[PDB]
Amino acid sequence: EVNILGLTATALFIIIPTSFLLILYVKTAASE
Amino acid sequence: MTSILQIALLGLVLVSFALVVGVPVVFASPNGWTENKGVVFSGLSVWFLLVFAVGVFNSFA
Amino acid sequence: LVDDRMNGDGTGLPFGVNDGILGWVIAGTLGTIWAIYFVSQKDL
Amino acid sequence: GRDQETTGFAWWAGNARLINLSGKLLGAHVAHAGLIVFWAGAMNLFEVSHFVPEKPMYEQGLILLPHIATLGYGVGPGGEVLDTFPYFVSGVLHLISSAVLGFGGVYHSLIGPETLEESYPFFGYVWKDKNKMTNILGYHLIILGCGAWLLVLKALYFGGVYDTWAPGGGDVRIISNPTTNAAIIFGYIVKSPFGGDGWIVSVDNLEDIIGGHIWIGTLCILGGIWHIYTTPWPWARRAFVWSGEAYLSYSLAAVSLMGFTACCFAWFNNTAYPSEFYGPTGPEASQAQAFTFLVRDQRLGANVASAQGPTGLGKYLMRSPTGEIIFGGETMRFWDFRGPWVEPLRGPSGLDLVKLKNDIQPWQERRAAEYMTHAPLGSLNSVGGVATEINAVNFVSPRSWLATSHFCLGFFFFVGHLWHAGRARAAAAGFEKGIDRVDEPVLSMRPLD
Amino acid sequence: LTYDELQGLTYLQVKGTGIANTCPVVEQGTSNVRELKPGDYKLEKFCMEPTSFTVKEEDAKGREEFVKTKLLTRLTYGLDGMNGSMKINNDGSVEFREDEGLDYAATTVKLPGGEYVPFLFTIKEFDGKGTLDSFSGDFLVPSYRGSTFLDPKGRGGATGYDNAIALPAKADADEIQRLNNKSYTPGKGSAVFSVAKVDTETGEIAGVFESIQPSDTEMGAHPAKDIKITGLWYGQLT
Amino acid sequence: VLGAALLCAIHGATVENTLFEDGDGANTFRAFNPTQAEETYSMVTANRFW
Amino acid sequence: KLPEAYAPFSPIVDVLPIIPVLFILLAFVWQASVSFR
Amino acid sequence: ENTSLWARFCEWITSTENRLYIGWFGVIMIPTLLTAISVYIIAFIAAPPVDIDGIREPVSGSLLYGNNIITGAVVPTSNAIGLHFYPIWEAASLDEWLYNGGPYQLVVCHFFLGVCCYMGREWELSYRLGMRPWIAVAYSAPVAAATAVFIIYPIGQGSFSDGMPLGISGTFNFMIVFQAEHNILMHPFHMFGVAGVFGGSLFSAMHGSLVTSSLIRETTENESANAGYKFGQEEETYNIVAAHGYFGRLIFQYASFNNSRSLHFFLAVWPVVCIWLTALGISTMAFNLNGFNFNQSVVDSNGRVLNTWADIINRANLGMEVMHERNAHNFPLDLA
Amino acid sequence: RAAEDPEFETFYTKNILLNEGIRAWMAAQDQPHEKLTLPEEVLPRGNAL
Amino acid sequence: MEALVYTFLLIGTLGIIFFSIFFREPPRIA
Amino acid sequence: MLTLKIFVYTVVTFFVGLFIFGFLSNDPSRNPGKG
Amino acid sequence: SLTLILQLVALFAVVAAGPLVVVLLSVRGGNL
Ligand code: CLA
Ligand code: CLA
Ligand code: CLA
Ligand code: CLA
Ligand code: CLA
Ligand SMILES: CCCCCCCCCCCCCCCCCC(=O)OC[C@H](CO)OC(=O)CCCCCCCCCCCCCCCCC
Ligand SMILES: CC1=C(/C=C/C(C)=C/C=C/C(C)=C/C=C/C=C(C)/C=C/C=C(C)/C=C/C2=C(C)CCCC2(C)C)C(C)(C)CCC1
Ligand SMILES: CC1=C(/C=C/C(C)=C\C=C\C(C)=C\C=C\C=C(C)\C=C\C=C(C)\C=C\C2=C(C)CCCC2(C)C)C(C)(C)CCC1
Ligand SMILES: CC1=C(/C=C/C(C)=C\C=C\C(C)=C\C=C\C=C(C)\C=C\C=C(C)\C=C\C2=C(C)CCCC2(C)C)C(C)(C)CCC1
Ligand code: OEX
Ligand SMILES: [Cl-]
Ligand SMILES: [Cl-]
Ligand SMILES: [Fe+2]
Ligand code: NA
């Protein structure tokens, strides 16, 4: 069982743009 | 008896038609309601008379 | 019957009341809010 | 009339230009009474004109001859039309009344007094004269009580109105011993609006209907005397907004409510809206499907009590959600049906299979015109029944049509109530034309975060 | 509620109260049971309602036990309106046999844990042989559905696709249980009865029963389980 | 498309109900002046409202 | 149908329902004739 | 006013200083909507399979019973119910209540009350902020649509089972069986609604473009063009005369929308009245008035049935009705 | 899962089967170049409709 | 693993909505 | 099992009573305007 | 038929009466 390809695809599509948006947010708030 | 009722109803249609085309014009006429009082009373009395005539002619027709 | 059911579905129950305790607590809650509002009316 | 720059309102708001002109209000209102009575008389004349006497009277596209026929005016024992003269005389009297009403309306709009209280204190009113508003409510409520007692006079003393529940298929019956008791009348008005009972669409018998009319006439007359002889209370004057615009909002919300109610009345009732004169409702013609099929296959030779359908419940019978036996079609959503041809087939506990086998009546059997055609399908463009049915018959059910017209127009009146509710509240506050641009409530109170 | 007072109630009073689901009882009768006069009877109105619904399940350790359940079905479980006969002698042997009526009921029940078990509560084609105290027999059990019933893929028995419409590359010797068999062979069940509260004047017997019948086989894909039904029945002798 | 119809309706209604006084006639459409440089609606009031 | 004494007037009857709809349309003519004042 | 418990309660409920204004419409909006949200989430996660059709042949519609979110849905009540009001206390068990279809009745009833009280809450904030109140009037179109597909259609067809399921695949199924038995796509109100949603998107893009183009330079390609002046001045930005000039030069410059109030009223009224009309079309077919039935409409001299686009749609609609309720029909005509 | 279990179904499954119905009953005259003279017993139905 | 994925994305988006509603940047310029 | 019904009926009448007396309780004067 | 001819002449008489009234009030003074 378990669709590991879909699990990986969904997991990276969450984490990588989320980390991208959060890193620009925290670096923007670090130096306003 | 049917012909009398039919002629009375036709006259009532024409009288009501005259009242419809005349009452708003005469009312909204500048200084017209105080001068056409006689003809409006005549038209209304005739209208009511033909209504009552058709009513009493239904029972014989 | 195989189970205990309320068996009040339909039958023309006013406000869906089937036992008197429910009507009494409805009237009690409305009267409680009414007493609070009346004693605390006129703002002050 | 008057112009915009002095009234403040554009042409598409011009009927509000006469808010403070009671005489023009009277002219517009009497003219509207003329319009309503004119449509009533005209349509009664058409429905007289387009009549086919041999057919049942619901396939001719007639909406209000059922209104006269529900009063029993020219109705046979089984439901035969017999005569059309009462419908004709009703239409003509309405037309003459329309002419006199319209003449009075145009007179008060044009040459009638521009403002009423300077010559007629009895007829003039500012919209804060709460005592005289209550007097007007008293007058109108006395009128409504008189109309209800008029229906009382017809039902008990003039020998009219059709009961669909008389044995053999109904009869026009002079109602003796109407049920006026407060327990049944109030339990009829305070129950649930769903299929278990139905709130206001639940009146199964005309003694119950006429007893409710006793109650409404007595209550309206006594409340009319009350409203005439009393003054508004401080709690009412604080909670309510008193202006002509707020009064519109109250009237609009109320009339939308009774419009929604009238829609449901037309959709479900077969008692105050006779199926023989209106066509079948939703649950019937489907109860008629199941009934005709059960009698037909028990006629051929196949049993129905041991007959089992495709899904395990029964093709022709099953048990209801409550322990009673109900019809086995897809009409099992309509097990709460009550129509004049099922009570002689209705047993206390079950459907009385031996009664179904033997005690079947041929009026019940011949009640198949509701089944075959006339179901409350009918499309926007007539045609037959379901959306796939082809151009074979010209029919639509007046129940459907004066249900949907009424509910749509009641929804629009709910919207009008919302509009004038908000505008009346904002105008009584003082900002109907907007915020004052220099001292806003926004800048006076705290920021959110 | 004895049948005599049930007929005197209007159709509105019973509506929504569930007393139509309740079978009539006997209060004026006797419990002598063997007192009933022998001969041939042609009785009518078999009333039959359940009181419990317990389902047999098989553990993988080797013992026989039952367990109570919770009904998903509402008040559609009683049997009402049959007719039949028994041939009674002086000693007590009977020849009970139903003929025709509402001899089935669609019912759905779940075991603890949450497994759907629908069944058709049938009593049809029941032969009754034995004494009044305890007489049993066998009754025909239909499948549940007609052969025209459709699965959500549209396949079926008498009508349907009977092939893998959803996926075209699966028709091997694996879907035989799901596609090829589609069995509706009717099973058989055993119901043991007992006659209690006999009436002498008008001939009314109203006892209890315990019926073993198999559950639904659905489409024959999975084997049926046994369901025992305990309840009370009623009948009027003529 | 449903969000676009949403935005069109909500924006039109919000502007129409924040139109300020801008006159003494109750017809607010004539209360607008194409010459004036002030906003026709209170976006502060609109923002705190939503 | 109409009775025998009123049968010839049925075509004159047969044009009435549009008149209330013509009333609001007449109001539109009124409002255009006063040039939308 | 300050030592009075009810006066304190009123001045907190009607306080516009809160993060979310609640008011007297909010004290009845919040519990119904929160209840509906809670039971909707719990049912969408772990709803046991529910029999929608009254034929003891249920659908799952829940994630923990083996489907994804778009194919999973809160499913309408049983056909055994109809409009029969089945809440938890009408069931001997939560389990039987779930199988019968009660959570749909609960979410739909609570969502109806919550949406109407959201209408009222929006009007209430408009009043307490000193505005004009017609936000609720513009909001009346989604409210009318929600009532039409959750209450009006169950009333008209006699059963909550015919109502719109809370889902996406369920939405498509209800929508398609609605096509099959009512022919909405050939109805003037639905054409007005489609014209209105397309026009609402059109006017949204048009207004957005005409006023984002009409920009006096205060925000450059940087975050803003504050070099002229920083934040804190009443010198207003943007333009509205040039937008009307561009729209006038666009086609014929006579149906002038020069007044910004007239323009925004038109953008407010067009999609609202069109969604009003399409919701009323749903309401008309609740009382089962359908749309245009243009089948068998074109014939030749010999009277032969001459095929038409309407006949194409008709055969599609009847091919839709044949799978509609495969086993829940025992009888030929579909009325119940 | 709907193939291995005749008990599982969704509104999605209903929609797929309904799409098959649309295809079968409409393409017959919608695509005249295909000469689709498919008889009525291969065209699929429900019960009673 | 299928169902918890859907549950997590749904409740996560609802969490972002909650956080944006109550813990947003306070609004400036009108 | 009717205990759930009693509890929910009580809380429903409580919320409805808050609504009824809240709008009975001089609601139109809860306005910043001169009215 | 004669029924259709009467229907049409009655139709024309009832549709042309209103504009006749407004034109007569426009040419016979005003106060409309
Ligand atoms: C229900 C329909 C209806 C009714 C009864 C009224 C009634 C009235 N309106 Mg009004 N109006 C309506 C619809 C209606 N309106 C609509 C739809 C609009 C939007 C276009 C308007 C816009 C409007 C404006 C802008 C104004 C009014 C005004 C008025 C008032 C005076 C009109 C007047 O004196 O000028 C006279 C009207 C005419 C000369 C044209 C009508 C022709 C005659 C009078 C009627 C038709 C003839 C008929 C057959 C006569 C019956 C005769 C009888 C014997 C049978 C009046 C009481 C005015 C007002 O508010 O008062 C201050 C005003 O300025 N209305
Ligand atoms: C349509 C006609 C009509 C109208 C417009 C009014 C209007 C009014 N009446 Mg009145 N009244 C009427 C008919 C009417 N009445 C009749 C026929 C009677 C005789 C029974 C009375 C007897 C009456 C009395 C004794 C009083 C009023 C009062 C009032 C005023 C206060 C309203 C109020 O109490 O708030 C709203 C009321 C409530 C929120 C509580 C009502 C209780 C419930 C709703 C009724 C129970 C029935 C049932 C449970 C409701 C469910 C069904 C419903 C959803 C349809 C108000 C202006 C008061 C007054 O005179 O002011 C000085 C007053 O005390 N009326
Ligand atoms: C409660 C209102 C109501 C109801 C329930 C009915 C019901 C009925 N009417 Mg009737 N009618 C009404 C009002 C009503 N009418 C009014 C006010 C008029 C005066 C114009 C007429 C004039 C009329 C005639 C002449 C006839 C009927 C006929 C009929 C019957 C069949 C309908 C038909 O044949 O074609 C159906 C007609 C339509 C589907 C047209 C729909 C028009 C829509 C609703 C207009 C609104 C659309 C949209 C919102 C407009 C937006 C733009 C706007 C800004 C202008 C039917 C039972 C026929 C009949 O059998 O004779 C008795 C027929 O001959 N009616
Ligand atoms: C284009 C507008 C339009 C049209 C054409 C209609 C048309 C119609 N409506 Mg309607 N309505 C409308 C708008 C419209 N409505 C709107 C906007 C609303 C608000 C949402 C309503 C709300 C409404 C309701 C609540 C009802 C109707 C009803 C009706 C039908 C009967 C009318 C009636 O008898 O009223 C009533 C007339 C009066 C109240 C005044 C007369 C008083 C009575 C008749 C006196 C009693 C006399 C007696 C019975 C006979 C004399 C006998 C002798 C011994 C004295 C009719 C076909 C009724 C219905 O659904 O059909 C049953 C109904 O109950 N409408
Ligand atoms: C009996 C109920 C009633 C009454 C007495 C009034 C009275 C009034 N309204 Mg009002 N209104 C109502 C119901 C009512 N309304 C409803 C139900 C709605 C929702 C649609 C509205 C929405 C509304 C708005 C938005 C406005 C008013 C306004 C006004 C004021 C000026 C009206 C005017 O001159 O406009 C002129 C009249 C016309 C232009 C005629 C309109 C023609 C319509 C649109 C065509 C449709 C007719 C068609 C045959 C019906 C189709 C069937 C239907 C199912 C769609 C006036 C005092 C104005 C105001 O606020 O003034 C303070 C205003 O802005 N009303
Ligand atoms: C099965 C049958 C069901 C159907 C019968 C239902 C009967 C319902 C009749 C209620 C009518 C009351 C109208 C008041 C409207 C609000 C006026 C107001 O703004 O009122 C406020 C106003 C402001 O001065 O004052 C006033 O006019 C005072 C008026 C309010 C009167 C107080 C209510 C009675 C109080 C009884 C207390 C119940 C106590 C709890 C009992 C618990 C038992 C254990
Ligand atoms: C005839 C008839 C009958 C009878 C009926 C009746 C008797 C009725 C009634 C009724 C009633 C007896 C009613 C009453 C009512 C009331 C109401 C309906 C109300 C209200 C109101 C409101 C809604 C409010 C609001 C508010 C608030 C909340 C508070 C403050 C103020 C305000 C306004 C804000 C019957 C069915 C039997 C039969 C058939 C027919
Ligand atoms: C003010 C105004 C207005 C309104 C108006 C109106 C509303 C009017 C009316 C009116 C009316 C409301 C009318 C009615 C009427 C009626 C008539 C006029 C009648 C009659 C009669 C006759 C003559 C008949 C006969 C007959 C018979 C008897 C039966 C048989 C057949 C016949 C038909 C032959 C408008 C909006 C415009 C504008 C604004 C202002
Ligand atoms: C043509 C014809 C006929 C005949 C008829 C006659 C010979 C008579 C009549 C009739 C009549 C004769 C009707 C009526 C109407 C009436 C009315 C419509 C009334 C009224 C009144 C009022 C409306 C009042 C008001 C007021 C005042 C002013 C004072 C104080 C306040 C009040 C509001 C109370 C018939 C149908 C048989 C048949 C067919 C043909
Ligand atoms: O459940 Mn919902 O959808 Ca009104 O149609 Mn009959 O049921 Mn069933 O089918 Mn088609
Ligand atoms: Cl069926
Ligand atoms: Cl489906
Ligand atoms: Fe803008
Ligand atoms: Na089928």
Numbering used by the authors:
A (entry chain m), L (entry chain v): 2 to 33
B (entry chain z): 1 to 61
C (entry chain w): 60 to 103
D (entry chain c): 13 to 461
E (entry chain o): 62 to 299
F (entry chain d): 204 to 253
G (entry chain k): 10 to 46
H (entry chain a): 9 to 344
From the paper:
From these four complexes, the photosystem II (PSII) complex catalyses light-driven water oxidation and provides the electrons used for carbon fixation. PSII is a homodimer with a molecular mass of ~500 kDa, each monomer contains cofactors such as chlorophylls (Chls), quinones, carotenoids, and lipids which are coordinated by at least 20 protein subunits. The eukaryotic reaction centre is a dimer surrounded by tightly bound monomeric light-harvesting complexes (LHCs) and trimeric LHCII complexes. In this work, PSII was isolated from the halotolerant green alga Dunaliella salina.
Initial classification of the dataset showed that approximately 20% of the particle population were in a stacked PSII configuration, containing two PSII dimers facing each other on their stromal side. Roughly 20 Å separate the two stacked dimers in both classes, as previously shown. The rotation axis of C2S2COMP appears to be broad region containing the N-termini stromal loops of D2 and CP29 on one dimer, and the stromal loop connecting D2 helices IV and V, CP43 N-terminus, and the C-termini of CP43, CP47, and PsbI on the opposite dimer. In the stacked C2S2STR, these stacking interactions also include a stromal loop from D1 which is pushed in the stromal gap by a change in the position of the PsbT C-terminus (green arrow in Figure 4k), this shift pushes this D1 loop (connecting helices IV and V) into the stromal space and closer to the adjacent dimer. In the stacked C2S2COMP particle set, the larger range of rotations means that at the extreme states CP26 and LHCII M2 are not involved in stacking interaction and can pair with additional complexes, while in the stacked C2S2STR particle set, the smaller rotational range seem to be restricted by CP26 and LHCII M2 interactions. The stacked C2S2STR (left) state 10 (cyan) is tilted compared to the initial position of state 1 (red), bringing the top dimer closer to the lower dimer, resulting in a shorter range of rotations from CP26 in state 1 to LHCII M2 in state 10.
